[PDB]
Short mmCIF file of C-alpha atoms and ligand atoms in Angstrom, two decimals:
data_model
loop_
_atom_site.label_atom_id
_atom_site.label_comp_id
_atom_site.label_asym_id
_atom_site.label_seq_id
_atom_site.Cartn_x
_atom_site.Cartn_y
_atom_site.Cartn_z
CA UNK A 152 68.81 104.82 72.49
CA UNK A 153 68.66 102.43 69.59
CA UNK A 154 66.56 101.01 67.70
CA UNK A 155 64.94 97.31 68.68
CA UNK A 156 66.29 94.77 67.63
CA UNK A 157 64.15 92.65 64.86
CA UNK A 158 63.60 89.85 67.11
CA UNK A 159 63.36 90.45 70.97
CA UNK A 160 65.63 88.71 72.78
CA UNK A 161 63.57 88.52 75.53
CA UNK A 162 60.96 86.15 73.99
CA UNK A 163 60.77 82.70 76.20
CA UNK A 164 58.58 80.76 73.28
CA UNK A 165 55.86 78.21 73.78
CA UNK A 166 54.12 79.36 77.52
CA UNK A 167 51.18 77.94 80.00
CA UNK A 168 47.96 79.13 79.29
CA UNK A 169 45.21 78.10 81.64
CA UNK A 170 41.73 80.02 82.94
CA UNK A 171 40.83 78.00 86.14
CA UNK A 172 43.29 80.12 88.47
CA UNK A 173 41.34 83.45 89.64
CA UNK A 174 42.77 86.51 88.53
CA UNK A 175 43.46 89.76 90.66
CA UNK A 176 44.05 92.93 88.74
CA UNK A 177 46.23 94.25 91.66
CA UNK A 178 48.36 92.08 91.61
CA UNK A 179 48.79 92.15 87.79
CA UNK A 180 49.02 95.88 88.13
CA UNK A 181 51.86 94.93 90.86
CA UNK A 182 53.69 92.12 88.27
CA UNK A 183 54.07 94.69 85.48
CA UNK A 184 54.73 98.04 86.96
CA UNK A 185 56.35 99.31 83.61
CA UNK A 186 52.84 99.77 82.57
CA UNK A 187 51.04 103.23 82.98
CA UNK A 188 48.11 104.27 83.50
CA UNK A 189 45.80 103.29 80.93
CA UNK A 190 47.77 100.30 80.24
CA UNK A 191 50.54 101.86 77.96
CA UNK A 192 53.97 100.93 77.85
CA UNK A 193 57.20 101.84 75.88
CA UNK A 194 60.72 100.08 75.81
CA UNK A 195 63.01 101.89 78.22
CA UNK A 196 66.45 100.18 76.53
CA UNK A 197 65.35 100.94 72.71
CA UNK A 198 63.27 102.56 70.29
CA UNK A 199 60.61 100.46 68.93
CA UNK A 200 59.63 100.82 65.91
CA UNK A 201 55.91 99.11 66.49
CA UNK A 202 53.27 102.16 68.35
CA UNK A 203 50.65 99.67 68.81
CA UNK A 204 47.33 100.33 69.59
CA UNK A 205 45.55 97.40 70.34
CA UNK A 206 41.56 97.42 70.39
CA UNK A 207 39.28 94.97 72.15
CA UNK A 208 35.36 94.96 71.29
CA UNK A 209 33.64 94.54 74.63
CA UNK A 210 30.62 94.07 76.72
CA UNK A 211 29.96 91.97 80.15
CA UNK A 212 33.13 90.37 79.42
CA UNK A 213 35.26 91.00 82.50
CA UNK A 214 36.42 88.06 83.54
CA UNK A 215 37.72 87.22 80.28
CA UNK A 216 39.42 90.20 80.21
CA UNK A 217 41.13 90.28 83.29
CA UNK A 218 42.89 86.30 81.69
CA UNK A 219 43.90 88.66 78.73
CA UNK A 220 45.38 91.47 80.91
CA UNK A 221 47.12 88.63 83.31
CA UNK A 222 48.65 87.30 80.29
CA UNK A 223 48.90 89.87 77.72
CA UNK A 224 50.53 92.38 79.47
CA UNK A 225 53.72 90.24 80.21
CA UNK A 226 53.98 88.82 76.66
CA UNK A 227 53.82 92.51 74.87
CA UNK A 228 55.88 93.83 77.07
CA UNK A 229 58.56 91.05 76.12
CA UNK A 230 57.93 91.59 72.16
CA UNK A 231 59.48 95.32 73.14
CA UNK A 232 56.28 97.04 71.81
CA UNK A 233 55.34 100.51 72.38
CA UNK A 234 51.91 99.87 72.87
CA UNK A 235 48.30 100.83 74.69
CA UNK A 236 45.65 98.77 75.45
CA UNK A 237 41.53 100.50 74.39
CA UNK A 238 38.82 98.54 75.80
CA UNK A 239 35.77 99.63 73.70
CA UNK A 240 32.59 99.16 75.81
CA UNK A 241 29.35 99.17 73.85
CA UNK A 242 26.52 101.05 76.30
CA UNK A 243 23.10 99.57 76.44
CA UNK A 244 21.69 96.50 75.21
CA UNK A 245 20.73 96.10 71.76
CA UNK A 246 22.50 93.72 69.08
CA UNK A 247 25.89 94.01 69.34
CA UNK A 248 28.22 95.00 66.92
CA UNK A 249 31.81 93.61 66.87
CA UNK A 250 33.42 95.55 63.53
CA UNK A 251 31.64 99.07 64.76
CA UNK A 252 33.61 98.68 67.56
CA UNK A 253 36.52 98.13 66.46
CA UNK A 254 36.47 101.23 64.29
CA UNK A 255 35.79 103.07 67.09
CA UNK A 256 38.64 101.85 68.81
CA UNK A 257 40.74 102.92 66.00
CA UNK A 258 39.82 106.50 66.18
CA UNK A 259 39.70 106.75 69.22
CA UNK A 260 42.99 105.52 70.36
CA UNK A 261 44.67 107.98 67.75
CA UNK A 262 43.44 110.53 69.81
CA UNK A 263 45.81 109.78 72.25
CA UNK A 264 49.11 108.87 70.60
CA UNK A 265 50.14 108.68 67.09
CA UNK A 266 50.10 104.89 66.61
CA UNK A 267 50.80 103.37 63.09
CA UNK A 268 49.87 99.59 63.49
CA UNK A 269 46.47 98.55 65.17
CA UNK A 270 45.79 95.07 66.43
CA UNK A 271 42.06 94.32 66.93
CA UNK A 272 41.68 91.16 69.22
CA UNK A 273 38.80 89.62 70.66
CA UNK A 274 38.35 89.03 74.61
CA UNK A 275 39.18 85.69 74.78
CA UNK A 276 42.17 84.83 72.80
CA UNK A 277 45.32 84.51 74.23
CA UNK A 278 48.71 83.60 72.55
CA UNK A 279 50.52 80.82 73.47
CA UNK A 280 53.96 81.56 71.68
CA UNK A 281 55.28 85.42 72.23
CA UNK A 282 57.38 84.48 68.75
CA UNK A 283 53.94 85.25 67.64
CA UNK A 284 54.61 89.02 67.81
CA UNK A 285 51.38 91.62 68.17
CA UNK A 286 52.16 94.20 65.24
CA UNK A 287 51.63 94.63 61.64
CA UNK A 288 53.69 93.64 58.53
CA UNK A 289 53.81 94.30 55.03
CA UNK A 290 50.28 93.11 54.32
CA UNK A 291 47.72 92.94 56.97
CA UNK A 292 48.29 90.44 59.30
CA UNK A 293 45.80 87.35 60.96
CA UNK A 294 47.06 86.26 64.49
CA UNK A 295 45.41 84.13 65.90
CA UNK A 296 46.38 81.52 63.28
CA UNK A 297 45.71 77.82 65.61
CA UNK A 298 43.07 78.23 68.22
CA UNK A 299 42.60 75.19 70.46
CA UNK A 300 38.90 75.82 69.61
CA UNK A 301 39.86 75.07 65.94
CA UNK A 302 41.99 72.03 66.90
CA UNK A 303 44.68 74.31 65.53
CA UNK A 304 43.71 74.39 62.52
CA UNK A 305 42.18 77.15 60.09
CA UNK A 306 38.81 76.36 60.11
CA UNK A 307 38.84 77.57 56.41
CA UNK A 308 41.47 79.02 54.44
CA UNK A 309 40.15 82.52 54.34
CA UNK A 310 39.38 82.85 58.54
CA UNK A 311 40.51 86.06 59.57
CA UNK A 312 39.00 86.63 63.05
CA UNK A 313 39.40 86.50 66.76
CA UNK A 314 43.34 88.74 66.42
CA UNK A 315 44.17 90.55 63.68
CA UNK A 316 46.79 93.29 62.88
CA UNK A 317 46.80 95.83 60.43
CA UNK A 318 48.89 99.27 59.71
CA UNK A 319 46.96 102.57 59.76
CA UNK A 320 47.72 102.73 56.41
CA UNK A 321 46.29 99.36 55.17
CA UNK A 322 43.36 99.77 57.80
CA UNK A 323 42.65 103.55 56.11
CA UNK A 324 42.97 101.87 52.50
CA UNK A 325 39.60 99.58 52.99
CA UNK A 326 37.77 102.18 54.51
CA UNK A 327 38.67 100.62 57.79
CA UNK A 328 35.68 97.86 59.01
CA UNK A 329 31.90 97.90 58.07
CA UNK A 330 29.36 99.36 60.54
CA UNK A 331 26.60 97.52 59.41
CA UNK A 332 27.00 93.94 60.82
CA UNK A 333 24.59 93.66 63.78
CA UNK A 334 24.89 90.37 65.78
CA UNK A 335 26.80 87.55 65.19
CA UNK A 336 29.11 86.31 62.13
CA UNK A 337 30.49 87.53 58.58
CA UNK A 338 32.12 90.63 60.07
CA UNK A 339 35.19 89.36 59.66
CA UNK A 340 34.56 87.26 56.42
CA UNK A 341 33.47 91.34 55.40
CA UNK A 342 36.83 92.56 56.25
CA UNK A 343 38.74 90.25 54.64
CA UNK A 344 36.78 90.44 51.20
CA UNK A 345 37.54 94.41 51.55
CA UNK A 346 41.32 93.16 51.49
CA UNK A 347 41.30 91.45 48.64
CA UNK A 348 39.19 94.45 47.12
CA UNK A 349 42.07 96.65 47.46
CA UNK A 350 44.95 94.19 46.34
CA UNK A 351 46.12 92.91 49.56
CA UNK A 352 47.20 89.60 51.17
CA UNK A 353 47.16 88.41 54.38
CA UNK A 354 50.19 87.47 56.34
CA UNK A 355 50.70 84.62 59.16
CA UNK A 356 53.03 83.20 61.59
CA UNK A 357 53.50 79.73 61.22
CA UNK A 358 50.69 76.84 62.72
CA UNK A 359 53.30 76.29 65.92
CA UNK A 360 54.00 79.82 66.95
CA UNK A 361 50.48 80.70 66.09
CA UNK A 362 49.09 78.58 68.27
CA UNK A 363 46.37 80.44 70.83
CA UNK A 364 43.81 79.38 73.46
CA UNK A 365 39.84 80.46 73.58
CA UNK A 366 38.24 80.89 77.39
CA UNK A 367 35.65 78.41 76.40
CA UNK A 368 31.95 80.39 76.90
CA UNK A 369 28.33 80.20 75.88
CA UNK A 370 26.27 82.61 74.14
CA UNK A 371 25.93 86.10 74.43
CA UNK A 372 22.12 87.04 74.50
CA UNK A 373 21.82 90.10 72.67
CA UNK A 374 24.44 88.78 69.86
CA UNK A 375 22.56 86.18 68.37
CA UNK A 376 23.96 84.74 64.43
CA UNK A 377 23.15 87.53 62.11
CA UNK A 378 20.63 86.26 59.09
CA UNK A 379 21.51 88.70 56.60
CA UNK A 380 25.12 87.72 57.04
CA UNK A 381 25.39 86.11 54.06
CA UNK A 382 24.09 88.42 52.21
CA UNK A 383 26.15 91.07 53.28
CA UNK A 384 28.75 89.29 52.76
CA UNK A 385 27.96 88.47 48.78
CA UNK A 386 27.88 92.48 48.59
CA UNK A 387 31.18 93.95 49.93
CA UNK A 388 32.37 94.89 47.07
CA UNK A 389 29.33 97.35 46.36
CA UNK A 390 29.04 98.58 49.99
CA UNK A 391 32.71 99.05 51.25
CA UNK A 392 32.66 102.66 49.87
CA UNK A 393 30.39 104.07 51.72
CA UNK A 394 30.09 101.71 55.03
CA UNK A 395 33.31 102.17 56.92
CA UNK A 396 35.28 104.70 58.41
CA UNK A 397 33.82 107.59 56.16
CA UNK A 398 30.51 106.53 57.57
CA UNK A 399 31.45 105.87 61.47
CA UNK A 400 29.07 107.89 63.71
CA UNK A 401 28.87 107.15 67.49
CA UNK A 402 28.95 108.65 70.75
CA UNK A 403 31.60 108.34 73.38
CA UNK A 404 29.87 108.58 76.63
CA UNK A 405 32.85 108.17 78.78
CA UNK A 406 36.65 107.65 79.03
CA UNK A 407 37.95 105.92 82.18
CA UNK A 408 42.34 105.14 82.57
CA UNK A 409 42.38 101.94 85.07
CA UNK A 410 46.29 101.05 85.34
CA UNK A 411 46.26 97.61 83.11
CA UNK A 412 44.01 99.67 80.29
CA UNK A 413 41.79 102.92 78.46
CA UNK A 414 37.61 101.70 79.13
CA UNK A 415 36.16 103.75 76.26
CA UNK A 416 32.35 103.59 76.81
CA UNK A 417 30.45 104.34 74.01
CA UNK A 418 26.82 104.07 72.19
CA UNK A 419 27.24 102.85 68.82
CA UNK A 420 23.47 103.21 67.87
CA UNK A 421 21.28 100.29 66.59
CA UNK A 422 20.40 98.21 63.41
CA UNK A 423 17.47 98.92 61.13
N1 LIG B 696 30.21 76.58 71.40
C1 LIG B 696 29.62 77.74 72.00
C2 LIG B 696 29.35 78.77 70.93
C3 LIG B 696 29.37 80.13 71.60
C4 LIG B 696 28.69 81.10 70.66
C5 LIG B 696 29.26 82.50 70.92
C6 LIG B 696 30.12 82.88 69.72
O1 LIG B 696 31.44 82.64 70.11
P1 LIG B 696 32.56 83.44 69.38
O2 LIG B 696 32.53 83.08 67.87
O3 LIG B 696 33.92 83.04 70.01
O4 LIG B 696 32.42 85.05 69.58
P2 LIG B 696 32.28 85.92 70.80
O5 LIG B 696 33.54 85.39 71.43
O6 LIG B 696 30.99 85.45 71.28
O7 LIG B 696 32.25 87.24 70.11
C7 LIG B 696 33.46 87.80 69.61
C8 LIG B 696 34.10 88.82 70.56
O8 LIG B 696 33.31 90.06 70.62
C9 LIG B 696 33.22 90.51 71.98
N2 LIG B 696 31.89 90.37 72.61
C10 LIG B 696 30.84 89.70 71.95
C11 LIG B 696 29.63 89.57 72.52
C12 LIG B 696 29.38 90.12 73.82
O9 LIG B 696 28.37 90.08 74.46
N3 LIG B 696 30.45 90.77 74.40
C13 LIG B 696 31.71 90.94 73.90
O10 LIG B 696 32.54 91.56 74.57
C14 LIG B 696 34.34 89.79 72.71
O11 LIG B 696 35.57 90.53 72.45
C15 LIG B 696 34.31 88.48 72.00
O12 LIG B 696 35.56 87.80 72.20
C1 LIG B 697 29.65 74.11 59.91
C2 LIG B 697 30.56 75.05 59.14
O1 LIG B 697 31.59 74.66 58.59
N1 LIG B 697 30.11 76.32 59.12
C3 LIG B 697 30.89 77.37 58.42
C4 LIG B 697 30.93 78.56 59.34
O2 LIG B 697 31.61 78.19 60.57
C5 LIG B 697 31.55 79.79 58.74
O3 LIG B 697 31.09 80.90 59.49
C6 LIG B 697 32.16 81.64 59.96
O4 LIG B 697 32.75 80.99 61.08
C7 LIG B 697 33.89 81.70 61.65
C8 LIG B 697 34.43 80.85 62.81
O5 LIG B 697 33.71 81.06 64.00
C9 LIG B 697 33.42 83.14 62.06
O6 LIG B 697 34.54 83.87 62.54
C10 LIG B 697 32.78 83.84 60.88
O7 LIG B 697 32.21 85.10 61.24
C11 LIG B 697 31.64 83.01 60.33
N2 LIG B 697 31.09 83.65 59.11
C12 LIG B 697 29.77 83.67 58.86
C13 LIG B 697 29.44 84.35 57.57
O8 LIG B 697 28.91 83.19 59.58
C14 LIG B 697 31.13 80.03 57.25
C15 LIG B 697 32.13 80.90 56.46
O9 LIG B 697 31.46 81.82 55.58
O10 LIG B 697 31.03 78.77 56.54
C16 LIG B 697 30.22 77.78 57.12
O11 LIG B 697 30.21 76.65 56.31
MN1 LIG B 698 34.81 83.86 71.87
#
């Protein structure tokens, strides 16, 4: 077998996104039988160079997710990525807690394959263009560059949430995410200060083949705006050290493989 080539040439470009049609797992399951169980997949016709693990922070959000499996699956498989798909279920019901999550998803999907690029995307974002290829690059790498829900634009030049990419190296040199950002908002704002605190840039696909829908949806209860989010925010610099990865505690209370994707569920503790 040989290597991938750079660009897939099985990429069809600008696709239909829509979320009034009702989705059926089976028959998902049934469309893309190359995935196993747990929702991994490898290219059968060349080595890929891309072992993508790709993370979703989650809670009551199953009908969203079943749009991103519907669609997801099909477009990955086309960008000839050998890739698995970690759901990372947050037990209970206190604030939740979007980055923490995501951390967790990190270590926990290296326990089941040696992946070297992780892409962290939110429940609700799906890519319109499969140019816009889900894997990392020389300097971590924002996604979901034009939502709809953004008009398709940035809503400020240093946005770096709802799909993100970065290698397990760059991910290990920030001391992965923070841990400490309970409810909604700055998260992400965090993450990409912690970039810049370690030299890095961020890399994007172009406005057209970074175009992406949002399933439009109200308010979680239970993730309400964060106050001290702009505090935290003013203060990465000081607290990236020792909130992160070297400071990641949780508790996985269970592992389920469902065909289209790994459910890790998994108490992640509470603020105070
Ligand atoms: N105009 C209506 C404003 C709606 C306010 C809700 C905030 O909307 P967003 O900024 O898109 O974030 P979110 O989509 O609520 O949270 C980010 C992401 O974390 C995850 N998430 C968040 C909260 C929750 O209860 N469950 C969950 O699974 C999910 O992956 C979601 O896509
Ligand atoms: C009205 C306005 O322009 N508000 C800006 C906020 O939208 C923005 O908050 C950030 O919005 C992003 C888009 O949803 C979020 O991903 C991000 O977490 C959130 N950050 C915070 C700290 O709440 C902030 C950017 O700091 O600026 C406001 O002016
Ligand atoms: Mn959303």
């Amino acid at each position: 077998l040989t290597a991938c080539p750079e660009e897939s040439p099985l990429l069809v470009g600008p696709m239909l996104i829509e979320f009034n049609i009702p989705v059926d797992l089976k028959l998902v399951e049934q469309q893309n039988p190359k995935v196993k169980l747990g929702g991994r997949y490898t290219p059968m016709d060349c080595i890929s160079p891309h072992k993508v693990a790709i993370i979703i922070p989650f809670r009551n959000r199953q009908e969203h997710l079943k749009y991103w499996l519907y669609y997801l699956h099909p477009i990955l498989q086309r960008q000839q990525l050998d890739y698995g798909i970690y759901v990372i279920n947050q037990a209970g019901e206190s604030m939740f807690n979007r980055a923490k999550l995501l951390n967790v998803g990190f270590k926990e999907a290296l326990k089941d394959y040696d992946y070297n690029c992780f892409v962290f995307s939110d429940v609700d974002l799906i890519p319109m263009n499969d140019h816009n290829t889900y894997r990392c690059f020389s300097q971590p790498r924002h996604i979901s560059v034009a939502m709809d829900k953004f008009g398709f634009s940035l809503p400020y030049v240093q946005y770096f949430g709802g799909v993100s990419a970065l290698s397990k190296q760059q991910f290990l040199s920030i001391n992965g995410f923070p841990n400490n950002y309970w409810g909604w908002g700055g998260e992400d704002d965090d993450i990409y200060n912690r970039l810049a605190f370690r030299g890095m840039s961020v890399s994007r696909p172009n406005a057209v083949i970074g175009k992406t829908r949002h399933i439009r949806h109200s308010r979680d209860k239970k993730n309400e705006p964060n106050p001290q989010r702009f505090d935290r925010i003013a203060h990465t610099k000081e607290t990236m050290l020792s909130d992160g990865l070297n400071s990641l505690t949780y508790m996985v209370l269970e592992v389920q493989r469902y065909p289209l994707y790994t459910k890790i569920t998994v108490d992640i503790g509470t603020p105070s």
